[PDB]
Amino acid sequence: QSTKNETALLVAKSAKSALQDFNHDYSKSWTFGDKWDNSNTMFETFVNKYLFPKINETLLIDIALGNRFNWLAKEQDFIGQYSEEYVIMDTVPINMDLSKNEELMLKRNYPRMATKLYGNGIVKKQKFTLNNNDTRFNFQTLADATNYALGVYKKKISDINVLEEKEMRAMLVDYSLNQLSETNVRKATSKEDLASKVFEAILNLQNNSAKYNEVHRASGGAIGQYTTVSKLKDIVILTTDSLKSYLLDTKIANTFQIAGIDFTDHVISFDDLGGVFKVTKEFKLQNQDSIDFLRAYGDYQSQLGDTIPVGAVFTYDVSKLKEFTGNVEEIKPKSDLYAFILDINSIKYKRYTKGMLKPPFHNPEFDEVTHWIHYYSFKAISPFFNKILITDQ
Amino acid sequence: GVYKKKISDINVLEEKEMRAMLVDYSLNQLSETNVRKATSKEDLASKVFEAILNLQNNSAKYNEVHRASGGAIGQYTTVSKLKDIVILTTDSLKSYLLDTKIANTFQIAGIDFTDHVISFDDLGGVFKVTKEFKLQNQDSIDFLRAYGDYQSQ
Amino acid sequence: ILNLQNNSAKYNEVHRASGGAIGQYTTVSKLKDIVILTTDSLKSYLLDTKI
Amino acid sequence: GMLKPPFHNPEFDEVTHWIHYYSFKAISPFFNKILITDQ
Amino acid sequence: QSTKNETALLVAKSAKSALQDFNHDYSKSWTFGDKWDNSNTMFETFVN
Amino acid sequence: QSTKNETALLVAKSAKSALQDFNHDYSKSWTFGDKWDNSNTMFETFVN
Amino acid sequence: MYEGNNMRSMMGTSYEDSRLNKRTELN
């Protein structure tokens, strides 16, 4: 519309703004003052129609976002780069007989040692710039400015948790879709059939069986067997919310919950699995709209002409931009009746959060300091534990 | 860790051995007086839940005292508490027995019915010999060496 | 209900805040601060389920 | 006594530990048993 | 000359090395590991 | 496949292995040392 | 092992690793 209001014309006069004094190397020095009227507009009180509108409160809403897999996180010393692991293969006890060659007492019997070698993690970073002169214009107390400087920092702590939780639930779906053997994969037909298969596959763990681990794709576990058991204190179902609302809605969940394990807290579920994307073709960055889209989510370091390798992850919705279409797929389970029952010790996850406040660079030209947050996180998944995937594929 | 694995596979051996014993017994040696016959899975569930309650009763009907050495004539009455009743079944059927309202009313203010039902994936990874054979091939010897059986040649 | 407790930028109306049109904002919610507002004829049906 | 003392074999310096145990498995006829099959 | 040994092929696959996880602005963030062999290499022990 | 890599050929050289010193009653005694390069292969870091 | 003047400026203390104080929020 259009407004011929005496106060709205004063409001919309942008040549008087504070931004004019900070986007020009020479600017206005002394203030004459302004006539402020609250008549026949908003901000109008019944008494004293000539005062400036005043703030009752300003409220920093700071939500503590949590990583649900944080109790799995071991902490290492960030030294070397290859973590390896190994088991001892089964040798079943044999009957003894007193009528043998009796120089087989001299014979040897070594253990057999299935292993697997893991690479490194990656170091991740994020920064935030806080200045000292222009952000003071909009808090009216020192306490609100310090709460702002602290809320920015705790948001930078919280989105690390969001990143790591979304990253690990992308790992556990990428694993089961692509890398997992089709011996651990059971196939369902309908939702009640899948519920009965999930509830019999929980009970297919806690059993001394060499059938449910992928020790055959360890380095030395191709011949022989390796028997794994799993308690119920370390079994986790990873599924969707539309299917957790059906698994918990059965009488078997009630008899698990009564006098026993908390079955609500062993079923880790999400809305539908995957907001994380993968790169399949090594592309480059060509357009400024994609650069600004990456700047919106805090990715400051990437510029035009940067190449993205095959297998890089993004952790937000990227596939709508012109040069990402086709080059980028999604870690999303096919035929969303989906449940992946694992032992929680299979997630080999360790970090290094020792010294993640690197000391600030001041930049006293603009008086805008910068704090960086560096952390090393190693995400892997071990083959020596019971895993079952129940899909319709 | 090598030593504690040698302790752990003793436990695996003995558990698999005893759950083979309890299946070999019921299939071959057990009398067909203790054997009830079901038709479907809900029918078998109702028979299991009435057969638990057929114990705790002073009855001479459910023991195989008739195949003891001197128990052919006369009767012998057995009772059983619920602290020493164990169901041995499969996981595909434990996921159906526990999924009933009777398991909920057993679990509430009473016995832990999840821990009295001992179940396995499907019963039997243990094999028996029926004809006394010998060992002739080197592939079978290496297959036995893979599982730790070093003494057989 | 279970679509909450998840770190997701899908369920808040931050896009109709003043400066939240571009970018994302992720919210979580505990179960100690989730409230369903419905009718009695439907609360007598939600509570009457095994869930 | 299921840790019998080791034989050293110091030619190759490879010791060996044996684990011997006696286990008796039986099943008594004087208790209530019910088998519910489809055979 | 070349080598058809599979772990030599594993060493030769430098695409999975850590160097590619620092030259680029994005990368993989999870590792599945690999079955490492020592046989027919310069890295054998007798036992394991 | 086949790899013409300077480090993978050193890896796949099995006559230098420790297993050669334990499956023969006479074997190599003194080590000369080896040139190890991590360039254009796996195990490659950005520094050193 | 050999120290000489080991605890020198910021990097010689940065490998003698520093201040595990802030960890991630859940546990």
From TrEMBL, chain D:
Instruction: Report which superkingdom the organism of origin falls in.
Output: Viruses
According to UniProt, the name of this protein is Major head protein
Lineage from the top down?
Viruses, Duplodnaviria, Heunggongvirae, Uroviricota, Caudoviricetes
Q: Which residues of the full protein are shown?
A: 358 to 396 of 408
From TrEMBL, chain G:
Q: How is this protein named in the record?
A: Uncharacterized protein
Which residues of the complete protein does this chain represent? 1 to 27 of 60
